[PDB]
Amino acid sequence: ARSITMQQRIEFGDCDPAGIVWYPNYHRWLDAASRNYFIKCGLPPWRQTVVERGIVGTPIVSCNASFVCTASYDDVLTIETCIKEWRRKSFVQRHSVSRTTPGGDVQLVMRADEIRVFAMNDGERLRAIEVPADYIELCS
Amino acid sequence: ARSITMQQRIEFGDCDPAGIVWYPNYHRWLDAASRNYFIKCGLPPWRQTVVERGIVGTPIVSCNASFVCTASYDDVLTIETCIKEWRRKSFVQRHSVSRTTPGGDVQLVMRADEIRVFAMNDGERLRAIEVPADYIELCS
Amino acid sequence: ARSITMQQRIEFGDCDPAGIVWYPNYHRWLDAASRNYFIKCGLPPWRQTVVERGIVGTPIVSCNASFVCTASYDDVLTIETCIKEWRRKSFVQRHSVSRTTPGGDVQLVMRADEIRVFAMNDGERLRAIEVPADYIELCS
Amino acid sequence: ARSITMQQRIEFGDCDPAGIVWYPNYHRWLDAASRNYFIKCGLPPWRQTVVERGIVGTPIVSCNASFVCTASYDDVLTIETCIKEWRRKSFVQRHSVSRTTPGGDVQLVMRADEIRVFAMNDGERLRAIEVPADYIELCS
Ligand SMILES: CC(C)(COP(=O)(O)OP(=O)(O)OC[C@H]1O[C@@H](n2cnc3c(N)ncnc32)[C@H](O)[C@@H]1OP(=O)(O)O)[C@@H](O)C(=O)NCCC(=O)NCCSCC(=O)c1ccc(O)cc1
Ligand SMILES: CC(C)(COP(=O)(O)OP(=O)(O)OC[C@H]1O[C@@H](n2cnc3c(N)ncnc32)[C@H](O)[C@@H]1OP(=O)(O)O)[C@@H](O)C(=O)NCCC(=O)NCCSCC(=O)c1ccc(O)cc1
Ligand SMILES: CC(C)(COP(=O)(O)OP(=O)(O)OC[C@H]1O[C@@H](n2cnc3c(N)ncnc32)[C@H](O)[C@@H]1OP(=O)(O)O)[C@@H](O)C(=O)NCCC(=O)NCCSCC(=O)c1ccc(O)cc1
Ligand SMILES: CC(C)(COP(=O)(O)OP(=O)(O)OC[C@H]1O[C@@H](n2cnc3c(N)ncnc32)[C@H](O)[C@@H]1OP(=O)(O)O)[C@@H](O)C(=O)NCCC(=O)NCCSCC(=O)c1ccc(O)cc1
């Protein structure tokens, strides 16, 4: 499937007392990579979609993640994101995070399969919508 | 199993432009609840265990999370944490996050099953260890 | 002046590789204490004020902070917040952060004087407003 | 003085319910720009300096910041960092954050003068040291 890649440098503050990336940081990066995928695919920013069609973004409903090896500040991560499956109102977005050894060897760092949905805010109530056909086309 | 509960107030800054908790924040809270469980169970802080026995903490190796309903600033979350299963070097730590409606009704917000391990830092290399028997006893 | 106090526990993830609170975390806490002051003083949540009168919150325009001593996970901080001065469209909000030694001795950890304003979002443009008289009264 | 520049893209999660960058995020970026300055100037990473000479990094002792205009997700910030003054054990590190209008016009977003020190961890006690002469030379 159509894959988008992005890089992410790890900062000192992104690490814990144990000297490695504090895990919630990976989710911050996964969230940026998720949105980056759609922006690169041609969708407008949520600020615009909300005005146009009520779409506030793609909130997450489920996640399955695995942490394979550690990473630390100064490491440059490479994130590869694709849509694994289009369902009805949901979609599975896969992210593979790697880093390179000075050997030119690519090591898998972590991976996550996120299940998200396009949604609208009906007043205070979040509500999922069927995946827009036009969006599927842009992402194909 | 032995369950520990803790509360967490959601702050304005913990929310996104869509006005609800930005997901990585739940993982920050899950991480605090994970450690809180061990502290409440009687283990010493990692600062001390590292000196004593080399244990740096309990890094995460895998996670399965589901987001059931939204939450926003001023909501007070209740997190319930327990150890679901002791394996060899790993353990499954379950966290249930809820909030209360003014109806006195308890709504499930999110849940996560985290797989972690007790580990040591051998120089720059993180390494898992068999779950310490003494720790299993404190947590029982 | 009217002072509001709140507590904040420091978490493992709130610390850096150097084992102490990573500074941006203090600002997260200062922001929560700022809002907590207004909530405790009786103002409604911004979600409501925006609908009622267009007020989105109190964005920061300036800050002067000093870090006196370190803090780490498990330390319980005590934050004291007050309004130091009401200007025209701005106000100076002071925050004093301390922690206690087991000696019953209170140590100053950090302090910050924040300059904020009540504001509205005119479309995409943030705009400060004269401090509402009713708010000054609630905070007095 | 020797100035180092770096870019920073603002993400959806870096914004608050008011749709603009939540302030503590600027400090995260200022901290990365501070370290980036030293790395670019040729100092080794703190992981190495701590082993070699005990230097854990450059903790902050004071800060004076001003927020000039707002920024939001997708905006690309440009951060310019330099050392404004070398004192004895401390130094003043200035950071100027800007963004560009599609007009090719550069708008100042925020600025901060941070006062930091090179330090060591003597056991649990952080301690400032006289600025290393060799470091001053690398940064010149
Ligand atoms: C999102 C929603 C309102 C959807 O509920 P709904 O309108 O009643 O519709 P429905 O239940 O049919 O769910 C829609 C789809 O999700 C699927 N789904 C929902 N939960 C799950 C799950 N646990 N596992 C698998 N699929 C799921 C569901 O099966 C359906 O898929 P499909 O069969 O149509 O293909 C409800 O699940 C909910 O509120 N969950 C909480 C969402 C939440 O708070 N997530 C955490 C914070 S989100 C804030 C955030 O970080 C963010 C980031 C980026 C961005 O662009 C926007 C937000
Ligand atoms: C942790 C480790 C070094 C373990 O590798 P190892 O020493 O070679 O040993 P091993 O592979 O046998 O794994 C140990 C156990 O984990 C189990 N395990 C590992 N991966 C998985 C997985 N994906 N699913 C299920 N079980 C798993 C494995 O089966 C074994 O369990 P058991 O059968 O003995 O009961 C390696 O998996 C690794 O480095 N993963 C990356 C860890 C990481 O970077 N996590 C994200 C950041 S952690 C920083 C953090 O946020 C933190 C928070 C709190 C705290 O207290 C400490 C840190
Ligand atoms: C806020 C504003 C639109 C105000 O501009 P304005 O409408 O043209 O009005 P004006 O310039 O007269 O400023 C209003 C007042 O601020 C005072 N002020 C502004 N800058 C300064 C400064 N550097 N030092 C001292 N006073 C200042 C100004 O003198 C006046 O005070 P007063 O004499 O009326 O008492 C403009 O300064 C601006 O956009 N600054 C950037 C704001 C920003 O992006 N802050 C960082 C992110 S804010 C997101 C956030 O974290 C947040 C947290 C909590 C919350 O409830 C809301 C948001
Ligand atoms: C840092 C220190 C131990 C220094 O105390 P000290 O060893 O007794 O020495 P001393 O008081 O003489 O201070 C050293 C210098 O700082 C100057 N200084 C200290 N406070 C101030 C202040 N408020 N305003 C101006 N200058 C100041 C002081 O005048 C002297 O400068 P100089 O005249 O020698 O040029 C003490 O001030 C302290 O613990 N402050 C708290 C530090 C803290 O917790 N900061 C917040 C978290 S730091 C965690 C972090 O985010 C981080 C980020 C990056 C990195 O690489 C490392 C850490």
Q: CB distance B13–C28 less than 8 Å? A: yes
Return d(Cα B40, Cα B33) in angstroms, integer.
Answer: 10
Residue D8 backbone dihedrals phi, psi, to 5 degrees? -145, 120
Partners of B19 on chain D (C-beta within 8 Å) are 17
What is each CA distance from D53 to A17, B22, B43, D24, D120, in whole angstroms?
19, 40, 33, 31, 9
In this structure, what token pair is assigned to residue D11? 């993400």
Q: Domain ranges in chain D?
A: 1-140
Q: What technique determined this structure? A: X-ray
Return d(Cα C45, Cα B76) in angstroms, integer.
Answer: 14
Return d(Cα D65, Cα A5) in angstroms, integer.
Answer: 35
Residue B103: helix, strand or coil by DSSP?
A: coil
Return d(Cα C7, Cα C5) in angstroms, integer.
Answer: 7
Return d(Cα B80, Cα B3) in angstroms, integer.
Answer: 6
Return d(Cα D37, Cα D41) in angstroms, integer.
Answer: 6
- H/E element holding B26? helix B24-41
Q: Is C99 exposed, middle or buried (0-12, 13-18, 19+ CB in 10 A)?
A: buried
In this structure, what token pair is assigned to residue D130? 């006289």
Residue with tokens 């370290």: D35
Q: Is A66 in the pocket of ligand 2 (CB under 6 A)?
A: yes
Return d(Cα D115, Cα A77) in angstroms, integer.
Answer: 31
Residue D58 backbone dihedrals phi, psi, to 5 degrees? -125, 75
Residue C103 backbone dihedrals phi, psi, to 5 degrees? -75, -10
Residue A102 backbone dihedrals phi, psi, to 5 degrees? -70, -5
Residue A121 backbone dihedrals phi, psi, to 5 degrees? -105, 110
Residue B17 assigned ligand-binding role: no
Q: CB distance C17–A15 less than 8 Å? A: yes
Residue A92 backbone dihedrals phi, psi, to 5 degrees? -105, 120
Among the bound ligands, name the one nearest to the CA of residue B75: 1
Identity at C26, one-letter amino acid code: Y
Distance from first CA to last CA of chain A, Å, rounded? 7
Please give the full DSSP string across C49-101, using - where no structure is assigned: HHHHH-EEE--EEEEEEEE-S---TT-EEEEEEEEEEE-SSEEEEEEEEEEE-
- Residue B45 burial (CB count, 10 A): 15
Partners of C24 on chain A (C-beta within 8 Å) are 13
Return d(Cα A93, Cα D13) in angstroms, integer.
Answer: 18
Identity at C107, one-letter amino acid code: Q
Residues C97 and C109 sit within 8 Å (Cβ to Cβ): yes
Strand-strand pairing, D3-9 and D76-86: antiparallel
Partners of D12 on chain A (C-beta within 8 Å) are 31-32, 35, 46, 57
Residues of D designated catalytic: 16
Q: Inform me whether the C-beta atom of residue A73 falls under 8 Å from chain C C-beta atoms.
A: yes
Q: Is D54 exposed, middle or buried (0-12, 13-18, 19+ CB in 10 A)?
A: middle
Residues D63 and D115 sit within 8 Å (Cβ to Cβ): yes
Return d(Cα B128, Cα A8) in angstroms, integer.
Answer: 27
Q: Is A118 exposed, middle or buried (0-12, 13-18, 19+ CB in 10 A)?
A: buried
Among the bound ligands, name the one nearest to the CA of residue C71: 4
> Which DSSP letter does residue C21 get?
B
CATH 3.40.50.720 fits D1-140, yes or no: no
Return d(Cα B122, Cα B117) in angstroms, integer.
Answer: 15
Please list, in sequence order, all residues whose beta carbon lies within 8 angstroms of the beta carbon of residue C100, skipping any fewer than 6 positions away: C76, C78, C106, C107
Return d(Cα A77, Cα A8) in angstroms, integer.
Answer: 5
